[PDB]
Amino acid sequence: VPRMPVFHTRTIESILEPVAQQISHLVIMHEEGEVDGKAIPDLTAPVSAVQAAVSNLVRVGKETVQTTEDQILKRDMPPAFIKVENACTKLVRAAQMLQADPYSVPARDYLIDGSRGILSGTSDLLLTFDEAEVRKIIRVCKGILEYLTVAEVVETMEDLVTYTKNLGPGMTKMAKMIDERQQELTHQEHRVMLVNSMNTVKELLPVLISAMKIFVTTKNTKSQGIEEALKNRNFTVEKMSAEINEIIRVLQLTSWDEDAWASKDTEAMKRALALIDSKMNQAKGWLRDPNAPPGDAGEQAIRQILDEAGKAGELCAGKERREILGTCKTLGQMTDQLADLRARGQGATPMAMQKAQQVSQGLDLLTAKVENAARKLEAMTNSKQAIAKKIDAAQNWLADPNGGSEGEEHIRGIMSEARKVAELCEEPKERDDILRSLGEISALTAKLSDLRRHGKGDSPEARALAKQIATSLQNLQSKTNRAVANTRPVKAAVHLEGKIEQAQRWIDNPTVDDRGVGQAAIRGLVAEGRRLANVMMGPYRQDLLAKCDRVDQLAAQLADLAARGEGESPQARAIAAQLQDSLKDLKARMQEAMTQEVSDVFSDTTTPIKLLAVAATAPSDTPNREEVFEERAANFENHAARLGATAEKAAAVGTANKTTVEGIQATVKSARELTPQVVSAARILLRNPGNQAAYEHFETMKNQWIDNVEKMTGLVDEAIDTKSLLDASEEAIKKDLDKCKVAMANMQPQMLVAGATSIARRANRILLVAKREVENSEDPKFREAVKAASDELSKTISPMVMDAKAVAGNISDPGLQKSFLDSGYRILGAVAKVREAFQPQEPDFPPPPPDLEHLHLTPPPPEEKDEEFPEQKAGEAINQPMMMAARQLHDEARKWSSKGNDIIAAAKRMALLMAEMSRLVRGGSGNKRALIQCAKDIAKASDEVTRLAKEVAKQCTDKRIRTNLLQVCERIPTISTQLKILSTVKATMLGRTNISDEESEQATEMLVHNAQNLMQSVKETVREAEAASIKIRTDAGFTLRWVRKTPWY
C-alpha cells in the first residue's frame, strides 16, 4: 500500500513544492546517463539540499509521537518515519557508490526507488499531522451534536440561561477553529462550502434562542400551539445538526467531493416533490368533476406534475428510472386521452370515469414512486457518511488492543449501515454481494469476540483472523460505496452555457466515448422546454414545442446516422448548421420566455407576509377568526411555492455561471423549508394575542425568511441580464395600465387599485434593478445616466399614487382620465429613459458607411502564424482523456487571434503542451526528461495567463464580471503547481522497479483529474477575460487585441 499524494493545505503546499524541485534535478540527470552521457557528478551537493528540508520535518514528528496521545498517530507516524528515513539513506548511498564508479548499474534502480520515497514518505508525514489537526475540530463538532441532542430535554427558563451559557462559548470556539481552516486550505471551493455551512450555523443561532423562548412560554402558559412549538425547535435542531455533519464531511477531503453529487441530487428531488404537491389539488380537482373544463388551470396542472416527476426520474436510477419515465408516459398518454374524449365529446361515460380514476390512482402511485426514490437516495447518503465517520475510530480495535470494551459498536455499528445499503439499493444482484460479504465478516467478528472474553488473542490464530477482517472490511466498504456509485449516477448539467458546449462537442464532432452526458444536455433542454410551456398559454406552447420537437429530430439524426460512420460527410455538415442554429434559437426562446416569466412573477415579492400580519397582529375578529386567516395562510404557501419554483427555473435557464446557479438553489431550498415555519409561527403566535413572543418571535421568523427572499431577487437578476429584463417589464406595465384605462369608468373598485398596485411594485422594482447595476459598476458616465433616469422614475411614481387614487370616487373626465394619463405617459417616458441608459451611449448607429472602392481606366502582415495538433499519434494502450481535454482548450482558443494578446498565445501553447503530455503517459519508458520539461512549460505558461488575467480584471469596470474573473483565474497558480508535483511523481513512476499496477494507475488518475481542472480552468478564464475587456474605462491601463479568427486574421 500507498493511497495518496495529498496537496490540500497552504502549510503543505510550500514544503512539497520545493521538494519536487529537489528530486527534479536528480530525475533528469538519471535518464541522461542511460542514453549517451553516462555522467552522474558529485551528488553530495544536491543531496545536502534534500536532507535540509527532510530533517526539519522528521524532528517535529519524532517529538509529536512522545507528546500527542492519539494512537492513530502512533500507528501511522512510524510508517511515515519509515519510508522517509529509509529512502533518504537509499539515495544517499548512491551518492557514495557512484562517487567511485559513476556507472553503477544496479544503483539506477536505487535512484528511482528512493526518489519515489521522497514523495511517498514526505507526504505520509504531513498527512499524519493534518489528520490529527482535523480531529481536534471533529471532536469539537461532535461535541456540538451531542449538546443539541439535549436541547429539547431542557424545560425551564433558569435551565435555558444555563444552556445558552454552554452552547454559547462552544459555538464561539468552533467559529475560530473554522476560521483557521479555510484561511489555510488550497481548494477555493472547499472554502466556499465551509463558509456557507457556518453562515447557516449563524442564521440558526437566532432561531435556536427563539425556539427555546417559545418552549418556556408554552410550558408555563400553555396555548393551542404546543405541538408547533416542538416543531419549531425540531426544524432548528435538525438543520443545525445537518450542517454540523456537513462541515465534518468537508473537513476530511483530499480530492474533490463525490459525495457532493449525492446530497445535491437528493436536494433536487426535495424541491421537485414540493412543486408536485403544490399542484396535486388542481390535479384531482380536474379529474373529479366530469368536465370541469380543459386546458385551463387543470390539464396544465396534471401535465406539470408529469414533467416535474420526469426530472426526478432522469436523476433517479437505471431500471427504477425506466419505470418513472415509463409511468410518466403511461399516465402522460392516458391523461391526454381523457383530454381528447371529454373535451371534444364532453361525455362522462362509465369508461371516462373509470379511466380518469385509473389516472389519479397512478398519479398518487407515481408520487409514491418518486417519494420512495427520495427516501432511498437520501438514505444512501446518510448511511455512507456515518460509516466514513466511524471507520477510523473503529479501526482501533482490530489492530490488537487486547481489551476492546465498547469497540464493538464500531464494527457492528458500522456493519449496521451495511445491510441498510443492501435493501436500500435495488438491482438484486449486487445486493446479494453486500449480504454475502456481510455474513462472512459476521462470522469472523464472532470468532474474535468469543476469543476476547476467554482470553487468547496474542496467538497465531487470533491474529490471522484479526487481520483477515480488516482486509475484508475495506472490501465490504468499497462494495458499499460501489452500491451508491455503480448503480445510479448520471453526471453534470447545472447551467446553460456549459450544457450548450457539452452538447456541442458530441454533436459537431464525432469525438465519442466519454460517458458523461452531452447527450443529456439534449435531454436537459427538453426538460427546460416542458416546464416553461405548461406554465404558459396557447400561442407560446405551439412555437416552443416546435423547437423542442425539432431539437430531438435533428439530434437523433446523429444517434442512428453517423454512429456507424458517416458524417463530416454532408450528413454531419447538415445537422451542424441546423442543430447549432436550432439550439441557438431554442435557448433564445427559452430566455425570452423566462425573462417575461420572471417579470410577472416577482413583481409582488411581498404580498403574503403582510396579509399574515393583519391577521394575528389584527385580533378583535368580526368575521370567522380562523377560517379567514387559515385560508389566507393557504394563499401564502401557494404563492410562496410559486416564487420558489420560478426561482430555480431561472437558475437552470440563465447566465448564472457555476457559482450563482448553486446559490439560487440553496436559496430556494432554505426558503421552502422555512415557508411552513412562517405559517407555523403564526399559529402559536397569533392564537393568543398579547403575549410577548406573540409579536417578538413571529417577527423573528418573518425576518429570517425575508433574508432569504431578499437574497433571492438578488441572485435572480444576476442571471437574467438587465437589458432584456427591462423589456418584459416594460411592455407588461403598459398592457396592465391599458387594462386599467379601459376598465376606467365601468368596473372601477379595486380594478383601479389593482392597476395602482402593479405600477406600484413594478416601477419600484425597476428602481431596484437600476440601483444594483449602479453599485455593480464604476464607469462614471454610465453610473450617471442610470441614476439620471432613476431620478425621473421616483418623481413619477409618487404623483401616480395621488392622481389615480383620487379617481376612486370618480369625477367628470376633464379631471380623472386626462390627469392620470398625462402622468401616465410620464411613467412610460421615465422608464424609456432608463432603457436608453443601458444601450451604448457612445457614437450612435449612423456608421453604415460602405467603402465603394470604384477603380478603373488604368498590404496586410499577420499571415504567418498558428499551429495544429495530431489525432491518432500514439495511443492504443489505455485512457487518453488527457488529449480530450487538450482538444477542449484548443477548440476555444483558436477562435481568437494570437498577436497583441499573449494570453491567447499562452493558452494555445497550453493545449499543445497538454497534447504532448497525453502521449507521454502510456509510452515513454525513457521519455522521463521530456515529461519533466513538459510540465515546466505549462507551469510557466500558466504564470503568463495569470499575470495578464489579473491585469485585465483591474481595468474592467463591472464588479460582477471583475470578481468572477479574478476568482476563476485565482485557482490557476495552485492548480499548475500541483501539476508540476504530480508530474514529477509520474516521472519516477511508469517503470519496472516493483511496479505496483494500482499505484501507477492511481498516479495517472490524479494527473488526469488535475489536468482536467487546469484545461477547463483556463478555458473559462479566456471567456471571462474577453467579457471583461468590453467595459474598459477611458483611462484604461491597457487593452489587448481581441478579434475572432476566420480566413481573416
Side-chain angles (χ1 to χ4, degrees), residues 835-852:
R835 158 138 255 156
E836 291 288 347
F838 300 95
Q839 273 241 71
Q841 44 167 283
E842 64 198 57
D844 304 298
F845 58 90
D851 231 316
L852 7 113

PDB file of all heavy atoms in Angstrom, residues 835-852:
ATOM      1  N   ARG A 835     -34.099  52.879 -20.198  1.00  0.00           N
ATOM      2  CA  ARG A 835     -33.675  51.988 -21.266  1.00  0.00           C
ATOM      3  C   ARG A 835     -32.509  52.559 -22.075  1.00  0.00           C
ATOM      4  O   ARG A 835     -31.530  51.861 -22.379  1.00  0.00           O
ATOM      5  CB  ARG A 835     -34.862  51.695 -22.171  1.00  0.00           C
ATOM      6  CG  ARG A 835     -34.508  51.244 -23.553  1.00  0.00           C
ATOM      7  CD  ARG A 835     -35.421  50.113 -23.934  1.00  0.00           C
ATOM      8  NE  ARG A 835     -34.730  48.830 -23.882  1.00  0.00           N
ATOM      9  CZ  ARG A 835     -35.342  47.663 -23.720  1.00  0.00           C
ATOM     10  NH1 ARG A 835     -36.659  47.624 -23.584  1.00  0.00           N
ATOM     11  NH2 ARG A 835     -34.641  46.536 -23.722  1.00  0.00           N
ATOM     12  N   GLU A 836     -32.612  53.829 -22.433  1.00  0.00           N
ATOM     13  CA  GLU A 836     -31.546  54.458 -23.188  1.00  0.00           C
ATOM     14  C   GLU A 836     -30.222  54.453 -22.401  1.00  0.00           C
ATOM     15  O   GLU A 836     -29.111  54.574 -22.983  1.00  0.00           O
ATOM     16  CB  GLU A 836     -31.944  55.884 -23.530  1.00  0.00           C
ATOM     17  CG  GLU A 836     -33.059  55.936 -24.524  1.00  0.00           C
ATOM     18  CD  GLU A 836     -32.596  55.535 -25.899  1.00  0.00           C
ATOM     19  OE1 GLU A 836     -31.369  55.454 -26.115  1.00  0.00           O
ATOM     20  OE2 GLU A 836     -33.456  55.309 -26.769  1.00  0.00           O
ATOM     21  N   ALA A 837     -30.341  54.309 -21.083  1.00  0.00           N
ATOM     22  CA  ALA A 837     -29.168  54.315 -20.239  1.00  0.00           C
ATOM     23  C   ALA A 837     -28.314  53.097 -20.526  1.00  0.00           C
ATOM     24  O   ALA A 837     -27.102  53.210 -20.753  1.00  0.00           O
ATOM     25  CB  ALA A 837     -29.571  54.355 -18.792  1.00  0.00           C
ATOM     26  N   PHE A 838     -28.946  51.933 -20.540  1.00  0.00           N
ATOM     27  CA  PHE A 838     -28.224  50.705 -20.819  1.00  0.00           C
ATOM     28  C   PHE A 838     -27.719  50.543 -22.288  1.00  0.00           C
ATOM     29  O   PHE A 838     -26.683  49.954 -22.505  1.00  0.00           O
ATOM     30  CB  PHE A 838     -29.089  49.496 -20.429  1.00  0.00           C
ATOM     31  CG  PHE A 838     -29.472  49.453 -18.979  1.00  0.00           C
ATOM     32  CD1 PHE A 838     -30.687  49.960 -18.549  1.00  0.00           C
ATOM     33  CD2 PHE A 838     -28.630  48.866 -18.053  1.00  0.00           C
ATOM     34  CE1 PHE A 838     -31.046  49.894 -17.218  1.00  0.00           C
ATOM     35  CE2 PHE A 838     -28.982  48.796 -16.719  1.00  0.00           C
ATOM     36  CZ  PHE A 838     -30.196  49.305 -16.301  1.00  0.00           C
ATOM     37  N   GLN A 839     -28.396  51.069 -23.299  1.00  0.00           N
ATOM     38  CA  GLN A 839     -27.928  50.890 -24.710  1.00  0.00           C
ATOM     39  C   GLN A 839     -26.693  51.876 -25.132  1.00  0.00           C
ATOM     40  O   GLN A 839     -27.048  53.023 -25.435  1.00  0.00           O
ATOM     41  CB  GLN A 839     -29.244  51.091 -25.504  1.00  0.00           C
ATOM     42  CG  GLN A 839     -30.053  49.813 -25.671  1.00  0.00           C
ATOM     43  CD  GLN A 839     -30.207  49.496 -27.140  1.00  0.00           C
ATOM     44  OE1 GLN A 839     -29.242  49.112 -27.820  1.00  0.00           O
ATOM     45  NE2 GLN A 839     -31.416  49.689 -27.652  1.00  0.00           N
ATOM     46  N   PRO A 840     -25.339  51.414 -25.324  1.00  0.00           N
ATOM     47  CA  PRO A 840     -24.144  52.277 -25.616  1.00  0.00           C
ATOM     48  C   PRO A 840     -24.335  53.688 -25.983  1.00  0.00           C
ATOM     49  O   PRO A 840     -24.771  54.006 -27.085  1.00  0.00           O
ATOM     50  CB  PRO A 840     -23.308  51.529 -26.710  1.00  0.00           C
ATOM     51  CG  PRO A 840     -23.461  50.227 -26.388  1.00  0.00           C
ATOM     52  CD  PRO A 840     -25.080  50.169 -26.060  1.00  0.00           C
ATOM     53  N   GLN A 841     -23.991  54.553 -25.036  1.00  0.00           N
ATOM     54  CA  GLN A 841     -24.195  55.965 -25.241  1.00  0.00           C
ATOM     55  C   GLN A 841     -23.151  56.664 -26.092  1.00  0.00           C
ATOM     56  O   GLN A 841     -23.309  57.848 -26.407  1.00  0.00           O
ATOM     57  CB  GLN A 841     -24.391  56.686 -23.889  1.00  0.00           C
ATOM     58  CG  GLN A 841     -23.442  56.318 -22.736  1.00  0.00           C
ATOM     59  CD  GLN A 841     -23.527  57.317 -21.560  1.00  0.00           C
ATOM     60  OE1 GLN A 841     -22.981  58.430 -21.629  1.00  0.00           O
ATOM     61  NE2 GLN A 841     -24.223  56.923 -20.486  1.00  0.00           N
ATOM     62  N   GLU A 842     -22.109  55.923 -26.479  1.00  0.00           N
ATOM     63  CA  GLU A 842     -21.049  56.449 -27.336  1.00  0.00           C
ATOM     64  C   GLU A 842     -21.671  56.596 -28.730  1.00  0.00           C
ATOM     65  O   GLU A 842     -22.792  56.162 -28.957  1.00  0.00           O
ATOM     66  CB  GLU A 842     -19.831  55.501 -27.330  1.00  0.00           C
ATOM     67  CG  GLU A 842     -20.065  54.101 -27.903  1.00  0.00           C
ATOM     68  CD  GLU A 842     -18.982  53.097 -27.486  1.00  0.00           C
ATOM     69  OE1 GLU A 842     -18.775  52.909 -26.268  1.00  0.00           O
ATOM     70  OE2 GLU A 842     -18.342  52.487 -28.370  1.00  0.00           O
ATOM     71  N   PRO A 843     -20.907  57.103 -29.695  1.00  0.00           N
ATOM     72  CA  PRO A 843     -21.468  57.392 -31.006  1.00  0.00           C
ATOM     73  C   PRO A 843     -22.604  56.479 -31.498  1.00  0.00           C
ATOM     74  O   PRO A 843     -22.505  55.248 -31.485  1.00  0.00           O
ATOM     75  CB  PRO A 843     -20.228  57.452 -31.837  1.00  0.00           C
ATOM     76  CG  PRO A 843     -19.568  58.504 -31.008  1.00  0.00           C
ATOM     77  CD  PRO A 843     -19.805  58.066 -29.569  1.00  0.00           C
ATOM     78  N   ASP A 844     -23.687  57.126 -31.945  1.00  0.00           N
ATOM     79  CA  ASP A 844     -24.927  56.457 -32.386  1.00  0.00           C
ATOM     80  C   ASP A 844     -24.787  55.439 -33.547  1.00  0.00           C
ATOM     81  O   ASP A 844     -23.667  55.056 -33.906  1.00  0.00           O
ATOM     82  CB  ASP A 844     -25.975  57.524 -32.754  1.00  0.00           C
ATOM     83  CG  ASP A 844     -26.251  58.506 -31.602  1.00  0.00           C
ATOM     84  OD1 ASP A 844     -26.727  58.059 -30.527  1.00  0.00           O
ATOM     85  OD2 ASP A 844     -25.991  59.723 -31.777  1.00  0.00           O
ATOM     86  N   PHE A 845     -25.914  55.008 -34.139  1.00  0.00           N
ATOM     87  CA  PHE A 845     -25.846  53.919 -35.187  1.00  0.00           C
ATOM     88  C   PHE A 845     -25.783  54.369 -36.653  1.00  0.00           C
ATOM     89  O   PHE A 845     -26.043  53.547 -37.540  1.00  0.00           O
ATOM     90  CB  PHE A 845     -27.019  52.909 -34.972  1.00  0.00           C
ATOM     91  CG  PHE A 845     -28.422  53.463 -35.012  1.00  0.00           C
ATOM     92  CD1 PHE A 845     -29.135  53.530 -36.213  1.00  0.00           C
ATOM     93  CD2 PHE A 845     -29.028  53.926 -33.844  1.00  0.00           C
ATOM     94  CE1 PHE A 845     -30.434  54.044 -36.244  1.00  0.00           C
ATOM     95  CE2 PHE A 845     -30.321  54.441 -33.862  1.00  0.00           C
ATOM     96  CZ  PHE A 845     -31.026  54.506 -35.064  1.00  0.00           C
ATOM     97  N   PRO A 846     -25.490  55.630 -36.897  1.00  0.00           N
ATOM     98  CA  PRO A 846     -25.301  56.045 -38.362  1.00  0.00           C
ATOM     99  C   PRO A 846     -24.020  55.517 -39.063  1.00  0.00           C
ATOM    100  O   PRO A 846     -23.779  55.828 -40.229  1.00  0.00           O
ATOM    101  CB  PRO A 846     -25.345  57.572 -38.292  1.00  0.00           C
ATOM    102  CG  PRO A 846     -26.446  57.792 -37.342  1.00  0.00           C
ATOM    103  CD  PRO A 846     -26.673  56.486 -36.623  1.00  0.00           C
ATOM    104  N   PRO A 847     -23.223  54.744 -38.385  1.00  0.00           N
ATOM    105  CA  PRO A 847     -21.992  54.164 -39.063  1.00  0.00           C
ATOM    106  C   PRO A 847     -22.128  53.097 -40.239  1.00  0.00           C
ATOM    107  O   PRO A 847     -21.185  52.335 -40.449  1.00  0.00           O
ATOM    108  CB  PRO A 847     -21.225  53.616 -37.858  1.00  0.00           C
ATOM    109  CG  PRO A 847     -21.399  54.646 -36.834  1.00  0.00           C
ATOM    110  CD  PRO A 847     -22.572  55.466 -37.275  1.00  0.00           C
ATOM    111  N   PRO A 848     -23.234  53.042 -40.986  1.00  0.00           N
ATOM    112  CA  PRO A 848     -23.256  52.076 -42.102  1.00  0.00           C
ATOM    113  C   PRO A 848     -22.139  52.239 -43.192  1.00  0.00           C
ATOM    114  O   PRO A 848     -21.974  51.363 -44.026  1.00  0.00           O
ATOM    115  CB  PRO A 848     -24.629  52.268 -42.693  1.00  0.00           C
ATOM    116  CG  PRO A 848     -25.455  52.274 -41.457  1.00  0.00           C
ATOM    117  CD  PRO A 848     -24.521  52.668 -40.338  1.00  0.00           C
ATOM    118  N   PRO A 849     -21.415  53.318 -43.137  1.00  0.00           N
ATOM    119  CA  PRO A 849     -20.525  53.747 -44.266  1.00  0.00           C
ATOM    120  C   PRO A 849     -19.824  52.717 -45.089  1.00  0.00           C
ATOM    121  O   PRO A 849     -18.773  52.217 -44.703  1.00  0.00           O
ATOM    122  CB  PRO A 849     -19.707  54.728 -43.525  1.00  0.00           C
ATOM    123  CG  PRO A 849     -20.846  55.545 -42.970  1.00  0.00           C
ATOM    124  CD  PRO A 849     -21.873  54.551 -42.490  1.00  0.00           C
ATOM    125  N   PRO A 850     -20.407  52.325 -46.248  1.00  0.00           N
ATOM    126  CA  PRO A 850     -19.742  51.356 -47.115  1.00  0.00           C
ATOM    127  C   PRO A 850     -18.472  51.930 -47.695  1.00  0.00           C
ATOM    128  O   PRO A 850     -18.314  53.143 -47.759  1.00  0.00           O
ATOM    129  CB  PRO A 850     -20.806  51.019 -48.126  1.00  0.00           C
ATOM    130  CG  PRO A 850     -21.976  50.820 -47.258  1.00  0.00           C
ATOM    131  CD  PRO A 850     -21.693  51.620 -46.007  1.00  0.00           C
ATOM    132  N   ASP A 851     -17.579  51.115 -48.102  1.00  0.00           N
ATOM    133  CA  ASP A 851     -16.420  51.531 -48.804  1.00  0.00           C
ATOM    134  C   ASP A 851     -16.742  51.086 -50.238  1.00  0.00           C
ATOM    135  O   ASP A 851     -16.647  49.904 -50.539  1.00  0.00           O
ATOM    136  CB  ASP A 851     -15.151  50.797 -48.351  1.00  0.00           C
ATOM    137  CG  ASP A 851     -13.905  51.611 -47.961  1.00  0.00           C
ATOM    138  OD1 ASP A 851     -13.573  52.565 -48.698  1.00  0.00           O
ATOM    139  OD2 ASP A 851     -13.283  51.299 -46.927  1.00  0.00           O
ATOM    140  N   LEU A 852     -17.137  52.055 -51.129  1.00  0.00           N
ATOM    141  CA  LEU A 852     -17.375  51.733 -52.564  1.00  0.00           C
ATOM    142  C   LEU A 852     -16.225  52.183 -53.388  1.00  0.00           C
ATOM    143  O   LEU A 852     -16.216  53.221 -54.042  1.00  0.00           O
ATOM    144  CB  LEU A 852     -18.556  52.415 -53.247  1.00  0.00           C
ATOM    145  CG  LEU A 852     -19.356  53.490 -52.560  1.00  0.00           C
ATOM    146  CD1 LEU A 852     -19.170  54.829 -53.252  1.00  0.00           C
ATOM    147  CD2 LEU A 852     -20.825  53.107 -52.506  1.00  0.00           C
TER     148      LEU A 852
END
